[PDB]
Amino acid sequence: METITYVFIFACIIALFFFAIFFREPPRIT
Amino acid sequence: GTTGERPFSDIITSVRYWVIHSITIPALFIAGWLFVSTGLAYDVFGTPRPDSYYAQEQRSIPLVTDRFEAKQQVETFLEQLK
Amino acid sequence: GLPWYRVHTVLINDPGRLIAAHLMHTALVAGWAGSMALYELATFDPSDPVLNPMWRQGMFVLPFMARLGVTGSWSGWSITGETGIDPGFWSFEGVALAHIVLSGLLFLAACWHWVYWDLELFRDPRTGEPALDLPKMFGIHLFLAGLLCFGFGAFHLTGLFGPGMWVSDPYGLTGSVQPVAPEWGPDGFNPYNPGGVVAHHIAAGIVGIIAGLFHILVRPPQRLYKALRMGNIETVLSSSIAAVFFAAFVVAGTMWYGSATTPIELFGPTRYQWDSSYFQQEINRRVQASLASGATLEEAWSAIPEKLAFYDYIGNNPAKGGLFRTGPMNKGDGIAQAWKGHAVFRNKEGEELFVRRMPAFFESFPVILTDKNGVVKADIPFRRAESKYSFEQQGVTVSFYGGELNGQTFTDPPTVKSYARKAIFGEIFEFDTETLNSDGIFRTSPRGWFTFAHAVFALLFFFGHIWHGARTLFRDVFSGIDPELSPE
Amino acid sequence: MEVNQLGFIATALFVLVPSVFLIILYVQTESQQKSS
Amino acid sequence: MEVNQLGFIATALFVLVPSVFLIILYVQTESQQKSS
Amino acid sequence: MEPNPNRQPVELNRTSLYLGLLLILVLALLFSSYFFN
Amino acid sequence: PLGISGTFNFMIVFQAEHNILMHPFHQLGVAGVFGGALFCAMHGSLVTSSLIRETTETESANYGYKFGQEEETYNIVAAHGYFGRLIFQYASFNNSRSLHFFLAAWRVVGVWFAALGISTMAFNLNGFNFNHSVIDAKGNVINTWADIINRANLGMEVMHERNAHNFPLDLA
Amino acid sequence: VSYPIFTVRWVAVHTLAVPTIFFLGAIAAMQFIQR
Amino acid sequence: GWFDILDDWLKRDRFVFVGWSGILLFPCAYLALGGWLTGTTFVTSWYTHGLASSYLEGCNFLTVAVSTPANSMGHSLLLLWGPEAQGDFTRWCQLGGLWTFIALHGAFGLIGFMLRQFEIARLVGVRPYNAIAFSAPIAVFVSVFLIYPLGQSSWFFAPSFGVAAIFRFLLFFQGFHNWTLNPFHMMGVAGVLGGALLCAIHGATVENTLFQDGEGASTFRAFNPTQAEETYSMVTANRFWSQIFGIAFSNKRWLHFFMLFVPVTGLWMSAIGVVGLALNLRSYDFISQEIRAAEDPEFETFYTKNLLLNEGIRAWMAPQDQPHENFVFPEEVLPRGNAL
Amino acid sequence: RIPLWIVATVAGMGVIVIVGLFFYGAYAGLGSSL
Amino acid sequence: ARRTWLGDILRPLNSEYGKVAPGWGTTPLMAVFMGLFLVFLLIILEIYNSTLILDGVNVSWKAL
Amino acid sequence: TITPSLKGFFIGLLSGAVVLGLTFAVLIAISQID
C-alpha cells in the first residue's frame, strides 16, 4: 500500500518532467 | 567610486614604515615570546603546565562539580594538586 | 498578473476590508479553540488523575482551561478528582460551546466589514483619500490592554472577582485552582512564585492605562515618524512581529524550564526534574524519616504516594520523545495502571546495589548495577564469554517494597535481570498497552510539544520581522533601483 | 508492515491540496484570453 | 468503532477531487474579465 | 455595494506552476516516509 | 550503496576507517561547498539587490526583463558601490567576468580536492590522527579534543559489519 | 597632500597587527616547551 | 546640530565604513574574534573536559578549541563578575566562560553586522535583500549555539568552537540524535549542496557564454566596468542547456535570485531541525521498521544496519565525552562484532 | 620608495619560516606523543 | 464614502492622520524609559538565570 | 539584600555604563572635530 504511495509520487514527478520540458513556456527573443 | 584615505603601497613601500617598525615589530614578537618564557601566560590563564596537570599519585580529573561554590573546587583541586 | 504572496497585500490601504480580515483570522482562531477543545474533550479520560492526568493522554489545549480555573465538566467530574460539585455554565463544555458561538458571530461581523467596506470613519477629512491614524490609534488599543491586564490582575486571579489560577507544590502534586495574592516583595520575580504573577498584571495594567492615555494624547516626533515611516501601516507589522516572536521565546522558556505559568501537573513534568533525581531524593527523605521513625522498610515505601513515584519515571521526562513519534505519551509505555514497588537490587553477598539510570540522551542503554559507592558489582554482558560481573555469576537478586509487588522478592536470573533493565527507567510500573495498543517506545509530553511549537514558530517570525521591517523601510527601492547611476 | 494510519490522508492530502491550489491559479490565469 | 480503513481517503478524496474540478472550472471562467 | 478599486488579478504562469508542483511532489515524496512512521 | 540511507552508511563507516573528517582534503571540500553555497546566495543576493527599475508594486518585479535583453538588468556599479563598502571596498568585484568566474572555480576546485580526498584515502592515506599525541611529564595522557573524535570513532569501528570480521585487524 | 597617520582605517589595521605579532611571538616561543 | 554631527561623521565613506551599526558590530565582533583566538593560544579547557585546548598546552590548529562550560553550570551566562566566577579572570578564564562570552558577544556581531548590511544598503539606494539572506546564518547560529544548548542540559553539550572539537559536534549528533536521518537537516544539505552547484554553475555557465569583446588571451580585462552591455549572451544560454539538460534559465533577475533562495532556505530548514534536537525531539524513530525489527531477526535494512553504528558511538564515547557523569562501562557491556 | 616586491618576498619568507617553525614544533613540540 | 452611526461617533480619533509633534520632542524621555527598561529584563533574566541572588528568592519549584 | 551576587550586578551595570559612556563621549568628540 504505502509503497504505491511512494511509487505514485515517484512517477507523477517523472511526468512533471514531461510537461515542464516539452510543454514548458518557451524563451521569446524580443 | 571616489576614494580618498591615506594609500597603502605608499607606506608598505615607505622608508619610514620599515624604520619605525623594524625595531617595534619584533618588539611584539619578542614580547609574546617573553610572555611564554617567563611562564606567566600559564598563571595568566590558569592553563596548567605539563609539569602539573594531574597530581602525582591520583589518576582522576580535577572536574568542577558545583557551579556556585566552583571557585573553591578549583582551589581544593589546584590545592592537593602539586 | 499579480503573484499570490502579493495578493493578500490587496488592502494595505482600505482598512475597511482589512478589519473584516483580522475580523476573520480572529473568527477562525476562536473557532479552532472551541474546536479541538471539544475534541480533546471528546477524549480526555478522568478515570484517574493519578496515573492518567491529562498530559499523558496527549492533551494540549485542555491543560489551560485549568490554569485559568475551569476544573470541571458538566458531567460531575473534575481534574482534581472532585465529587458532587459541578461548575456553572462555564465548564469545559461551556468554554468550548463558548468560542464556538464566538467565532461563529465574528464570521458574520466578518462578512459585514467587506460589502460595507467604505465608511466615513475610514476616510480622512483634510485628505482626499483613505488614511488611518496610527500614532494614536495604537495608544488607544494599548489603554484597553492594560485596562484589561489590570482588570484581570486584581479583579480575577486575586480571587476577588472570579477563581484563582492553577497552583500547587512539589509534593502530591496536590494542585488546584485557588485565589492568589499579589506579593510585590522581591520574590515576586521568582518565576515560580505564583503570587509573583497576579502582582505583575495588576501592576503592568497601571503602566498600560497611563501609556495609552499618553499615546492617545502626545504626538510622535517628526524625527521618528520620518524614521519609523509611521503612517505606512507596513511598519506596524514589523513593529509587532518583532514582539510577538519574542513573546514566543518567552513562552518557550517558561514552558520548558519550570514556571508557575506552566504547572507541573497541567503540563508534563519538567525534563530537568529527572536530570537531578529531584523526585527520588525528595522521596528518600520521606522514606528515611518514616524509616528512622520506627517503620518496616515495607511500611516505609508503601508510605510513599502513587503520583509521586510516577514522577520519578523517566518515561515522563519530556526529552525522551521523538520528532515524529506521532502521539500522546500513552501509545508509548502504555497506560500507567499502577506502581509495582521500589526495586532494590541485592547482591548475593547481601550488599545493596543501584541501577545506574539512563541519562535523557540515550534511547539505548546497558544496565549496570553499581555498589552504593559508584563501584561496579553487576551488569548484563554483551561479550558474555569473558563476563566477570554477570547477574548469574554474581547472584544478583531483587526484592520489592511498596507498590503491588510489595514484600515479594524474585530470584531467578531472568526476571531479576528484566526488572533491572526496566528500573533503568526510574520507578518500575504496570502499563496496560493492549487497550490503546502501544508500541513500546516513548513520546513527549504536552510541555514537550508546546515548546517545540513556539519554537520553530518564533524562530521563523523573527524572519518576518526582518522581512517586513526591510520591506517597510525600503518600500522605496522595492520597485526598482532607480535607472540613475554613478554617484558614490 | 505496521505503519501509521494517516499515511494516506497525510501524505496524499499533502499532495493534492496545495497542488490543486497551483492548478487553480494557473488555469485561472491561462483563461484570461478565454483560452483553456 | 471498528470501521473500514479507507474511510478517510475514500469519503474525503470523494469530496475534494470532483469538488476541486468544479472549483477550477468556475474561477477559470470568472477570470475571463481578469477579475477573481 | 460600490466596487472597491483594489481588485488586481492574480498570477502564476505556465512555468511557475511546474516549479510549484515540483516543489510539492518532492516534499511529498520526502516526508511521505516519515508520515508513515 | 545506491539509496538514501545507504550513503549515510557508506559514510559513518568511512569516518571510522579513515577519520575522513580530520582529512585536509575533505576540509578544502566542505570548504568550497559551504562557500559556493554561500556565494551562490551572495551573488544571487546582490544582483537582485541592485536589480533596477521596471515595475509597480502590484506587478512582479521579476517581470522587468525580456529573454535576449541586450543590456543586463542589474546596476553593477551601484552594487559594488555597496558591497565593496560593506567592509573593505577592495575585497569586492567590479569585474563581472572575474566574479562569475570566482563562483565557478571555488565550488569546482574544492569539490575536486574532496573527490580526491575519497580517492586519496581510497588507498588508505586517511585523515590526520592525534590520538595520545598530547602528554604531560609522567606521561599521564591528556586527551586532545581529537581523542573524543577518535573515541566516537571506535564506537563506529567496533560495530560496523559485525559478523564477517573474523580477525583482529580491519585490514579492509 | 598630507593624510594623517592616525586614520579610522588605521586604528583597526592596528588592533590586529599588534596582537598578531604579539601572539606569533608567543607561539614561536612555545615551539620548545618540552617536558 | 548634535546628533547629526555624530551621524555626519561616522556615516561617510572613509574606507572602512563605520556606522550607527558599527557601534555594536565592531566591538562585539572584535572581542569575539579575539575571544576565540586567545583561548586557542593560551586558555586551557581542562577544568571542564579534562581536555587540552590550547597551543600553549601543546594542542595544534585542528586540536585547539575554546572549550564549553562544565555540566555543573548549565545555562548560567557564567558572568565574569557573576557569583560563579566573581571577576577572577583566571578562574573565570578557567570555568570556561570565554564561551558564553565568545558566543554572546558574537551573537551580536551578527545582529550588528546584518544591520550594517541594512545601513550601508539604505544609504546606497539598493534593496536590503542581502541583509535578509543573512538570516540564513543568524538562524543557524542562534539555534545551534544558543537554542539547542538552551534546550538541553548545559552550555556544555553546545558546539565547541573548535576545529576537531566541532567535528565531535557532528558524530555526537549522528550517534545520539541520529541527525543524518532527519528530514529538516536533509533540506539543510539539499540547500547548501544544491546551492553550491547552483553557484559553481552560474559562475562557469556565465564565463563560457561570454562575448569576445576584448582583444586576445585575456577575456578578464575586455569587460566594461563603465556601462550596460550583457557580457554573457543570455540567448547562447538557454539554447544550450535547453538541449543539454532539457531546461533553460530564461531571465537573470530570477536566476540571480533563485540563487539567493536555495541556501538561506535550507539553512532555515536546518535551524528548524536542530530546534527539534533542542528538546530531544529527534528523527531516530522509524517505527514501521523497528516494530518488525523485533520479530524477523533476519530482516535488515541499511536504516537499522546504520542505526547500529550509532548505538556503538554511544557506548564508547559517552564515558569520556560526558565526564561529569563519571560513566563506567565494564569490559563486557561494550557492544562489538565478532572479531574486534 | 623601497621596491614593492622586495618587501613581499622578505615578508613572505617570514610566513614560510615562521610557519615552517610551527611544523617542526609539532614534532618535538609538546604536542608530539613522546 | 459612507458614514453612519459609529462612523460619525468615531470620526475624530481617526481624523488627524499626519498629526505629528514638532522635531525630536518627546524622544529623550523615551530613551530614558528605554534603557531604564533594559535593566528590568536583564535584572529579571539574571535573577532567573540564577546569576542574580536575593533572599527568600531562590528560584526553584520550592516556593511556598 | 546586597548579596555578593547582587553587588556583582551593580558592579556590572557600572562597567556597562562606563564602556558605553566612555565610548559615546569620545565619539561625540571626534564627530565634533569635523
Ligand SMILES: CCCCCCCCCCCCCCCCCC(=O)OC[C@H](CO[C@@H]1O[C@H](CO[C@H]2O[C@H](CO)[C@H](O)[C@H](O)[C@H]2O)[C@H](O)[C@H](O)[C@H]1O)OC(=O)CCCCCCCCCCCCCCCCC
Ligand atoms: C529566531 C530569531 C532569533 C533572533 C536572534 C536574536 C539574538 C539576540 C540574543 C539575545 C538573547 C540571547 C541570550 C539569552 C541568555 C539567557 C540566559 C538563559 O538562558 O537563562 C538560563 C535559565 C535556564 O535555567 C535552567 O534551569 C534548569 C533547572 O533549574 C530549575 O529547575 C530545577 C529542577 O530541574 C530546579 O528546580 C531549579 O531550582 C530551577 O531553577 C537547569 O539548572 C539548567 O542548567 C538551567 O540552564 O533560563 C532562564 O531562567 C531565562 C528564561 C529563558 C528565556 C528563553 C527565551 C528564548 C530562549 C530560550 C528558548 C529555549 C527553548 C527552545 C525550544 C525550541 C525552540 C525555542
Ligand code: CLA
Ligand atoms: C498549536 C500548536 C499545537 C501543539 C503544541 C499541538 C500538540 C499536540 N497535538 Mg495538535 N493540533 C493543532 C495544533 C497543536 N497541536 C492544530 C492547529 C490542529 C488542527 C489541524 C491539531 C489537531 C490534532 C489532532 C487530531 C491530534 C492532535 C494531537 C496533539 C498532541 C499529540 C502530538 C501530535 O499529534 O503532533 C504530531 C507531530 C508531528 C506530526 C511532527 C511532524 C509534523 C509536521 C509539523 C512536520 C512537517 C511540518 C511542515 C508541513 C513541514 C513542511 C515545511 C515546508 C517549508 C516544506 C500534542 C499535544 C493528538 C492528541 O494528543 O490527541 C488528539 C491528536 O490526536 N492535534
Ligand code: CLA
Ligand atoms: C509597551 C508599550 C509601549 C509601546 C508600544 C510604546 C511605543 C512608543 N513609545 Mg513609548 N512609553 C511607554 C510604553 C510604550 N511605548 C511607557 C510605559 C512610557 C513611560 C511613561 C513611555 C514613554 C515614551 C517617551 C518619552 C517616548 C515614547 C515614544 C514611543 C514611540 C517611539 C518609537 C519607537 O517605539 O521606536 C523605538 C524602537 C526601538 C527602541 C527598537 C529597539 C529595541 C531592540 C533593538 C532592543 C535590542 C534587542 C536585544 C537583542 C534584547 C536585549 C535584552 C537582553 C539584554 C535580555 C513608540 C510609538 C517616543 C515618541 O515619539 O512617542 C510618540 C517618545 O519620545 N515613549
Ligand code: CLA
Ligand atoms: C504575523 C502576521 C503576518 C501578517 C498579517 C502578514 C501579512 C503579509 N505578509 Mg507576511 N510574514 C510573516 C507574518 C505576517 N505577514 C512572518 C512571520 C514571515 C516570515 C516567517 C512573513 C514573510 C513574508 C514574505 C516573504 C512576504 C510576506 C508578505 C505579506 C503580505 C502578503 C503576502 C501574502 O499574504 O501571501 C499569501 C499567502 C499564501 C498564498 C499562503 C501560502 C503560503 C504558505 C504555504 C501557506 C501556509 C499557511 C497555511 C497552510 C496555514 C497557516 C498556519 C499558520 C499557523 C501559519 C501581507 C501583508 C508578502 C509581501 O507583502 O511582500 C513583501 C511577501 O512577499 N510575508
Ligand code: CLA
Ligand atoms: C536578529 C537580529 C536582528 C536584526 C538584523 C534586526 C534588524 C532590524 N530590526 Mg529588529 N529586533 C530584534 C533583532 C534584530 N533586528 C529582536 C531580538 C527584537 C525584539 C523584539 C527586535 C525588535 C525590533 C523593533 C520594534 C523594530 C525592529 C526594527 C528592525 C529594523 C530596523 C533596525 C532596528 O529596528 O534596530 C535594530 C535593533 C538592535 C540592533 C538592538 C540592539 C541590541 C541591543 C540594544 C544591545 C544591548 C544588548 C545587551 C548589551 C546584551 C547583553 C547580554 C545580556 C543579556 C547577558 C532592522 C531590519 C524596526 C523595524 O524594522 O521597523 C520598520 C523596528 O521598529 N526590531
Ligand SMILES: C=Cc1c(C)c2cc3nc(c4c5[nH]c(cc6nc(cc1[nH]2)C(C)=C6CC)c(C)c5C(=O)[C@@H]4C(=O)OC)[C@@H](CCC(=O)OC/C=C(\C)CCC[C@@H](C)CCC[C@@H](C)CCCC(C)C)[C@H]3C
Ligand atoms: C561555512 C561556514 C561559514 C563561515 C565561517 C562564514 C563566514 C562569513 N560569512 C559572511 C557573510 C555571509 N554569509 C552569508 C550566507 C551564508 N554563510 C554561510 C556559512 C559561513 N559563512 C552559509 C550558512 C550561508 C549560505 C548563503 C551571507 C550572504 C553573508 C554576508 O553577505 C556576509 C559577507 O558579506 O561575507 C563576505 C561574512 C560576514 C563577516 C562578518 O559578519 O563579520 C562581522 C561580524 C562577525 C562575523 C563577528 C561574529 C562573532 C561571533 C560569530 C563569534 C564567533 C566566534 C567563533 C564562531 C569562532 C570559532 C572559530 C572556529 C575555529 C571554532 C563571513 C564572516
Ligand SMILES: CCCCCCCCCCCCCCCC(=O)O[C@H](COC(=O)CCCCCCCCCCCC)CO[C@@H]1O[C@@H](CO)[C@H](O)[C@H](O)[C@@H]1O
Ligand atoms: C528525482 C526526481 C524527484 C526530484 C525532482 C528532481 C529535481 C530536478 C532539479 C530541477 C529543479 C531546477 C529547476 C530548473 C530551473 C528552471 O528552469 O525554472 C523553470 C522551470 O524549469 C524546470 O526546472 C523544468 C522541470 C523539469 C526539468 C527536469 C527534467 C529532467 C530530465 C533531465 C535529463 C537531462 C538529460 C524554467 O524557467 C523558469 O521560468 C521561466 C518562466 O517560464 C523564467 O523565465 C526563468 O527562465 C525560470 O528559470
Ligand SMILES: CCCCCCCCCCCCCCCC(=O)O[C@H](COC(=O)CCCCCCCCCCCC)CO[C@@H]1O[C@@H](CO)[C@H](O)[C@H](O)[C@@H]1O
Ligand atoms: C596556502 C595558503 C593559501 C590559503 C589556504 C592556506 C591554509 C593554511 C592553513 C593553516 C592554518 C593552521 C596553521 C597550522 C597550525 C600550526 O601548526 O601552528 C600552530 C598554531 O597555529 C595557528 O596559530 C593557526 C593560525 C591561524 C589563526 C587565524 C586567526 C584569524 C585572524 C588573523 C588576522 C590576521 C590579520 C602552533 O603549533 C601548535 O602548538 C605548538 C605549541 O607551541 C605545538 O608544539 C604544536 O606544534 C601545535 O601544532
Ligand SMILES: CC(C)=CCC/C(C)=C/CC/C(C)=C/CC/C(C)=C/CC/C(C)=C\CC/C(C)=C\CC/C(C)=C/CC1=CC(=O)C(C)=C(C)C1=O
Ligand atoms: C529524496 C529526494 C527526492 C529529495 C531529497 C529531499 C529534497 C528533494 C529536498 C528539497 C526541498 C528543498 C526546498 C530544498 C532546498 C530548496 C532549494 C531551492 C534547493 C536548491 C536545489 C534545488 C531545489 C534545485 C537545484 C537547481 C540546480 C542544481 C540546477 C537548476 C538551475 C540550472 C539549470 C542552472 C544552470 C544554468 C545556468 C545558467 O546560467 C543558464 C542561463 C541556464 C539556462 C542554466 O540552466
Ligand SMILES: CC1=C(/C=C/C(C)=C\C=C/C(C)=C/C=C/C=C(C)/C=C\C=C(C)\C=C\C2=C(C)CCCC2(C)C)C(C)(C)CCC1
Ligand atoms: C580575548 C580577549 C580580548 C581580546 C582579545 C584579543 C586581542 C584577541 C586577539 C587577537 C587576535 C587578533 C588573534 C589573532 C589573530 C591572528 C593571528 C595571529 C593569526 C593567525 C595565524 C596564522 C598562523 C595565520 C597563518 C596564515 C594566515 C594568516 C592566512 C594564510 C595562511 C597562513 C598559514 C599564512 C578581550 C579584550 C575581548 C577580552 C579580554 C581577552
Ligand SMILES: CC1=C(\C=C/C(C)=C\C=C/C(C)=C/C=C/C=C(C)/C=C/C=C(C)/C=C/C2=C(C)CCCC2(C)C)C(C)(C)CCC1
Ligand atoms: C452553525 C454556525 C456555526 C458554525 C460553525 C462553526 C462555529 C465552526 C467552525 C469551525 C471552525 C472553527 C473551523 C475550523 C478550524 C480549524 C482551523 C481554522 C484550522 C485548522 C487547522 C489548521 C489551520 C492547520 C494547522 C496545521 C495543519 C494544517 C496540519 C499540520 C500542523 C499545522 C499547525 C501546520 C457557529 C458555531 C460559528 C455558530 C454560528 C453559525
Ligand SMILES: [Fe+2]
Ligand atoms: Fe550574476
